[PDB]
């Protein structure tokens, strides 16, 4: 337990996520107190929602912590798919919070501004700190998307609060809600697509275009007859696993062919390669 | 579309499963409209429960029809991971609904809505009847959804005999806890498959396979053994063998393939490296 925290502070993304966790629960206590201070009209709901947000941040932090673990017999590849799974569940949570924004808009449908300013300062701190989001490339992408969704949703609710006061429109809140949900869903689509591609054992998109030339280079090797059962997939970000079977001549140089195939697929970016070499009868 | 309708009305097992769906979605609509009508949060939570159970079934059919597709260059293994992903996604969605209705239940327990509209206040024993007949007549989730309807059973009795407003939130949190408990095992299996974990049905026989491969003549060591689950009962295994400078690579390859095929591995890649000395 004591050494768990030192591993957390050693890792940059983990320490930033713990910064966010501590800040989120501190402001949660503050706003819960302000909530039970005789103002529980809609803020109790807001309190519970940013508890959900803190849960998502905790999911990202836990994903990083498990990702830096050591492999064993049960988890021979490690726990490096935890970042991909976190990105996936964070994208799905963003879809669900888009649905919740839609429900909030439908709460009005056809028929004081102080928790939101601290939410705004929290979320601009998030934009500043997590600018490099764009195990970092998968966890920080989902965390950046979640923080952006909360950021721009709070922006939308403040836009509603400022339109009903300055010019007195009663329709802008549902329309800003549908704009809000549509924009965050459109933003979260690419991360879900990449996560689904990784978890479906799809060929890595960066590796996909360079693979036919790699197969041509392997087929050009002296004494190789055919390539079979070539499978490439993404383990984690920028780690590709590849397998293929080679039918070679009955007297082919298996050492040289193995070394050349490994070289060819190493220049392409395949970290883990398994080449089975089968000697032909004829 | 004409051929589809006649076929599904003549078979038997498909007829029972489509009865399962159509009745379940129908009463999901009815009890959702009753819940949004009055203040039955617990009832709309139960509606979300068996709504997502019906989506689990129909997403199972959709994932089956997707995994029937032929593999291409991009998807080398095919679309067989679609069933695992669909189960995982629906489990996550059930978790999310459980958490949100937990939140709304605590909010309702803070201040009770005091609506208690009756009308056909007996929608709840209709829900009990329908999920009983669904789970028995048709085909831990085999009995978890039975406990979901009993939550609104006592809420309606408490919502009539004394009108105690604390009951409906308590049923909402109880339903949420039941949902997460029911969903946990499927999520565990899906997480294990998607994390490239060694298949549990293969883990106990793997040390014996390693000892058998090591006993092969000319084999020096086993390195970088990786086994994972592609889909149900389809295991992919990779390993690298360091062998003698003059070992029988053909025989060693055949014996390693036999050893791991007897253990249940369907896709095996054995890389053989000849030692310098």
């Amino acid at each position: 337990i004591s050494g768990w925290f030192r591993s957390i502070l050693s890792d940059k993304t983990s320490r930033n996520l713990f910064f966010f966790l501590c800040l989120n629960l501190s402001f949660a206590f503050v706003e819960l107190l302000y909530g039970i201070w005789s103002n529980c009209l809609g803020l109790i709901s807001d309190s519970f929602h940013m508890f959900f947000d803190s849960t998502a941040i905790l999911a990202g932090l836990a994903a990083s912590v498990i990702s830096k673990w050591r492999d064993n017999d049960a988890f021979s590849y490690g726990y490096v798919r935890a970042e991909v799974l976190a990105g996936f569940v964070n994208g799905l949570f963003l879809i669900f919070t888009a649905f919740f924004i839609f429900s909030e808009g439908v709460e009005r449908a056809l028929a004081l501004l102080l928790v939101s300013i601290l939410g705004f300062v929290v979320n601009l701190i998030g934009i500043f700190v997590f600018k490099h989001g764009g195990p970092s490339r998968q966890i920080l992408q989902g965390v950046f998307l979640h923080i952006l969704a909360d950021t721009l949703g709070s922006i939308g609710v403040i836009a509603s609060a400022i339109m009903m006061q300055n010019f007195g429109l009663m329709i802008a809140d549902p329309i800003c809600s549908i704009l809000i949900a549509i924009l965050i869903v459109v933003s979260v689509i690419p991360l879900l697509r990449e996560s689904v591609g990784i978890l479906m054992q799809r060929t890595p998109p960066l590796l996909e275009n360079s693979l036919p030339q790699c197969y041509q280079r392997v087929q050009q090797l002296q004494g190789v007859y055919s390539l079979q059962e070539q499978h490439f997939w993404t383990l984690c970000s920028d780690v590709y696993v590849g397998t293929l079977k080679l039918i070679v001549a009955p007297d082919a140089d298996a050492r040289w062919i193995l070394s050349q195939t490994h070289n060819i697929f190493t220049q392409a970016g395949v970290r883990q390669l398994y080449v089975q070499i089968d000697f032909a009868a004829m | 579309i004409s051929g589809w309708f006649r076929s599904i009305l003549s078979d038997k097992t498909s007829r029972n499963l489509f009865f399962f769906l159509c009745l379940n979605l129908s009463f999901a609509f009815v009890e959702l409209l009753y819940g949004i009508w009055s203040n039955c949060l617990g009832l709309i939570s139960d509606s979300f429960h068996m709504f997502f159970d019906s989506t689990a079934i129909l997403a199972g059919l959709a994932a089956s029809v997707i995994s029937k597709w032929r593999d291409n260059d991009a998807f080398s293994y095919g679309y067989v991971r679609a069933e695992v992903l669909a189960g995982f996604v629906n489990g996550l969605f059930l978790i999310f609904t459980a958490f949100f209705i937990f939140s709304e239940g605590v909010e309702r327990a803070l201040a009770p809505p005091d609506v208690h509209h009756e009308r056909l206040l007996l929608v709840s024993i209709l829900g009990f009847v329908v999920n009983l007949i669904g789970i028995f007549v048709f085909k831990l989730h085999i009995l978890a959804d039975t406990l979901g309807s009993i939550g609104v059973i006592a809420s309606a009795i408490m919502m009539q005999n004394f009108g105690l407003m604390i009951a409906d939130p308590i049923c909402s949190i109880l339903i949420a806890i039941l949902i997460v408990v029911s969903v946990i095992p499927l999520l565990r299996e899906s997480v294990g498959i998607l994390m490239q974990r060694t298949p549990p049905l293969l883990e106990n026989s793997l040390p014996q396979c390693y000892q058998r491969v090591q006993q092969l003549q000319g084999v020096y060591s086993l390195q970088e053994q990786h086994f994972w689950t592609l889909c149900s009962d389809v295991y992919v295994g990779t390993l690298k063998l360091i062998v003698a400078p003059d070992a029988d690579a053909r025989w060693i390859l055949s014996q390693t393939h036999n050893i791991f095929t007897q253990a249940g591995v369907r896709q095996l890649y054995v890389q053989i490296d000849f030692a310098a000395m």
Partner: antibody, heavy 118, light 112 residues
Framework: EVQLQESGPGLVAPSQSLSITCTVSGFSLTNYAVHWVRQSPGKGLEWLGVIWSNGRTDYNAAFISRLSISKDNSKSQVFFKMNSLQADDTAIYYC????????????WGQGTSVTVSS | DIVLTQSPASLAVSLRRRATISCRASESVDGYGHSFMHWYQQKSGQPPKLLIYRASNLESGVPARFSGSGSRTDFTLTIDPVEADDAATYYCQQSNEDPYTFGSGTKLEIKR
């Protein structure tokens, strides 16, 4: 008993074709690759090509447009056809059995001297 | 391609002594622990005879006085002791890269 015999024309007119037959004994062409190497006083030992057990041919990129190697497993013969013979092609042409599972060549024929002149 | 440079072009060594022939490769002929370099011996009016394959493995039936060593780009053929029948030309051949290329050749001259 592993023995390779090359039989070809000693004299070849310039810009004509050179055809050498390598007859093997003591091993089968069904599981052995045969290389072709020429040795000249100027350019030394030059590797030309190899025919594999299934008929796959790999050639030197300098001769790819004018070289062709074929074989027939029934009579255990390998056929070496070269076109556009020029004055720099005077060399002793060997057919060599590839050392099994290695990139070397363990058995060589005696070699046929080929003189390209008018 | 890979250019193999043999030094010296000619070597004079007396009886019962050690002779050293070096082959230098333009690019590395190593792959995953194996050095795809082969040594041949060609006597007068004879086809080349393989001595060492993969830079340290004696061909079956060659005398134990022939030795090979080296890796990456630098390789050494060592004859110890040097006999009278070792009067021949020694070639290094690489097989790491297509096309196969041979060394320039080193003539071992027997001093008497």
């Amino acid at each position: 008993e592993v023995q390779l015999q090359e039989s070809g024309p000693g004299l070849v007119a310039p810009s004509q074709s050179l055809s050498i037959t390598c007859t093997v004994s003591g091993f089968s062409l069904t599981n052995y690759a045969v290389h072709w190497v020429r040795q000249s006083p100027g350019k030394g030992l030059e590797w030309l090509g190899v025919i594999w057990s299934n008929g796959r041919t790999d050639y030197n990129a300098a001769f790819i447009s004018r070289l062709s190697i074929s074989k027939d497993n029934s009579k255990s013969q390998v056929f070496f056809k070269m076109n556009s013979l020029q004055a720099d092609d005077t060399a002793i042409y060997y057919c060599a059995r590839k050392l099994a599972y290695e990139g070397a060549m363990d058995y060589w024929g005696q070699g046929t001297s080929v003189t390209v002149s008018s | 391609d890979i250019v193999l440079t043999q030094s010296p072009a000619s070597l004079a060594v007396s009886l019962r002594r050690r002779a050293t022939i070096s082959c230098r490769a333009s690019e590395s002929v190593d792959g995953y622990g194996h050095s795809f370099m082969h040594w041949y011996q060609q006597k007068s009016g004879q086809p080349p005879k393989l001595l060492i394959y993969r830079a340290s493995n004696l061909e079956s039936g060659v005398p134990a006085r022939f030795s090979g060593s080296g890796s990456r780009t630098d390789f050494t053929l060592t004859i110890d002791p040097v006999e009278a029948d070792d009067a021949a030309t020694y070639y290094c051949q690489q097989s790491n890269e297509d096309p196969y290329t041979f060394g320039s050749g080193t003539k071992l001259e027997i001093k008497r």
